[PDB]
Amino acid sequence: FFIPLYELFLTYGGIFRLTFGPKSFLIVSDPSIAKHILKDNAKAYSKGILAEILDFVMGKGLIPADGEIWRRRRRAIVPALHQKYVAAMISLFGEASDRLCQKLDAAALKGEEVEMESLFSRLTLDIIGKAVFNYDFDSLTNDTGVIEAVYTVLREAEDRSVDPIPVWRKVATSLKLINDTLDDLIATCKRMVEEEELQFHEEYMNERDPSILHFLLASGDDVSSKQLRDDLMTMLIAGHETSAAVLTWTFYLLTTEPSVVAKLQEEVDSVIGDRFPTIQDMKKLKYTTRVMNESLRLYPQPPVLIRRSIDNDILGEYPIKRGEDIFISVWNLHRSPLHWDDAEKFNPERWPLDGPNPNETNQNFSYLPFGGGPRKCIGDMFASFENVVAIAMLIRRFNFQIAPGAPPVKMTTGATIHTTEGLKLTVTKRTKPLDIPSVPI
Ligand code: HEM
Ligand SMILES: CC1=C(/C=C/C(C)=C/C=C/C(C)=C/C=O)C(C)(C)CCC1
Incomplete structure (x- = not known):
């Protein structure tokens, strides 16, 4: 859906009306207009279509909610994700990632290829189930009716x-x-x-x-x-398929830039070795963070944010009335040639390696991996560390290449950008089994 919206954004600009019969969407690709909808004038908007989509499963969860019910539940849940809790969750990220490494190690020894997307989905489901409501899906090992x-x-x-x-x-x-x-x-x-x-x-x-x-x-x-x-339920859905996609596209992107993999291997070997990462490692894994940052820029989850105006407003310099269905193309903001050099290149160092981590504020809303304004993701630190831990631990132990004769990698987007047929890779060990565990400091 959003792929044709990129060229239309190049031709017709930051805001245009996509009409299909008697219905229409407002398509926003301008960071200034996005910031007005998401942050400056957020009270003028509701989640719109988003609620009609997710209501059957999320009910009165945060994502599709609006009004006081949203405000009361947001105020109650955000305290649960305090620094100590996030620090504790990092151990969970390392354990679950290690269970995945054990599977990859088994396949590596047999020369077997691995479909990473399905495994990343199992990994991120196992993590989110334990972190949110203390359930052990163990989808990495078994299948259940629950799974x-x-x-x-x-x-x-x-x-x-x-x-x-x-x-x-x-x-x-x-x-x-x-x-x-x-x-x-x-x-x-x-x-x-x-x-x-x-x-x-x-x-x-x-x-x-x-x-x-x-x-x-x-x-x-x-x-x-x-x-x-x-x-x-809402947090279970939110925290699962987003990071599953982030890891999938990260490793795809790594196959396309062997120089990034060498730089990433160099950092991970030096900073953590065979260790479970800790909270103190999150600041030390700079290049790993940038790789995650750049993966979320190239493949946002979701590629589009959804709003509906509930009042009069001005978008760019066009006046709108209430009832407009609005689709903010995060894909277009993230790849806009106006606001990014070599926007299609996988380049983790496009933000200075020792400078601030990019967010919607210091990127002036050309970059919204977790949204912006009052409805911003509450799990942004949770998921940012979860993905850094997974990348570092996997890259430490294995080399990944596109598997010979693997199906093509194409996008099939619903709420997240899945692949058409998986990400089939050959996986090869970087460390020998009889090597003593290496703990760096
Ligand atoms: C890479 C992983 C993730 C990405 C890319 C992501 C992305 C987003 C985005 C863009 C929004 C804003 C949606 C909007 O404005 O309509 C959002 C909201 C939300 N996310 Fe995340 N998310 C991730 C992981 C998580 C995790 C781990 C949690 C765990 C609690 C979570 C919970 C939520 C909740 C509850 C909201 C709704 C907040 C509100 O409306 O007040 N997400 N997410
Ligand atoms: C808000 C939100 C989510 C749902 C997004 C949806 C429902 C996106 C639909 C996009 C469309 C219609 C794209 C068309 O090309 C997630 C991923 C559950 C969790 C993170 C934030």
Whole structure:
């Protein structure tokens, strides 16, 4: 959908009306206009179509919500992602990534090729399930009805994402299994909170169940079980398929630039060796961060942000009324030749390696990996570190190349940019099994 919008943005500019019959979208590719919609005048907008897409699974979760219900739930959930909790989650990122490395090691020894997209999906599902509501999917190793239920739901969400866009049964069961499973976790976590002796503060975290579900229950907001299930469900959907795509496209991009891989291997060998990364390593893995930054620029998740005007406004210098469906093309902002040198080149050092990490503010909204304004992603640090940990640990241990005769790598976008047929790679060990673990300082 958004691929033709790139050339149309080159011809017709930062804001234009895509009409298809009697319906139309406003297509925004101007960083100034994006900043006006996302941050300066955000009160004039709702999530619009986005809610119609995600409502069946996310209910009253943060992403599709607006108004006071959004404001109250945002204020309750954001404290759960404090620095100590993010620091603890980094251990989880290292454990789960290590379980993936073990699979790649097994395949490497047998000369087997690996389809990385499906594995990255299993890895990021295993991470998000433990981090949010203390569930161990173990989708890296096994398949369960719970796991199959999640993917059924994700397939339906992708269908609802493509449905309102012009081109030029088992769901209800999967929802019931996920919701009942959440109920059991909520129940189990309630007993644990009733029995503990911990005092609640701004950095509250039970070291045995550091999940977001546990923080919320120990805070005592006392909302409905549906509202809590939907908040957890929303974060489960948000934190999963986004990073799965980020890792997939990162490693694809690494196949296209062997000089970046040498630079990345050099950093990871020197900074972490065989270690599980820690919070202190997140600042030290500069080039790894830039590689993630540049991957999210080349392949944003999602490529498009969705709003609907609920009041009069001026976009660029065109007046609009309420009721306009707006699609901010993050893809166009990220690749705009106006605002990027060699915009199609994979170049992690396009931001100075020792300068500030890029965000929507210092890039003046030409770069929105996590959005902007009041609706900005609350998991931006969570996911930023999750992906740095995965990249570093994988690159330390293996060399990846496009597999011979692998299917082509094409984009199939619903809510995230998936590939058409996977990312088939040959994986080769960089360290020998009989080598003593290398711990650098
Ligand atoms: C690479 C990974 C991720 C990317 C690229 C990403 C991207 C985004 C973006 C662009 C938005 C803004 C959407 C909009 O303005 O309509 C958003 C919102 C949100 N994200 Fe993330 N996300 C990621 C991971 C996560 C994780 C790990 C969590 C865990 C809690 C999470 C939870 C949320 C929530 C709850 C919102 C809604 C916030 C609100 O509306 O107040 N996301 N995400
Ligand atoms: C907001 C949001 C999400 C959903 C995005 C959707 C639903 C995108 C649909 C885009 C379309 C219609 C693209 C057409 O080309 C995620 C990924 C669940 C989590 C992160 C933020």
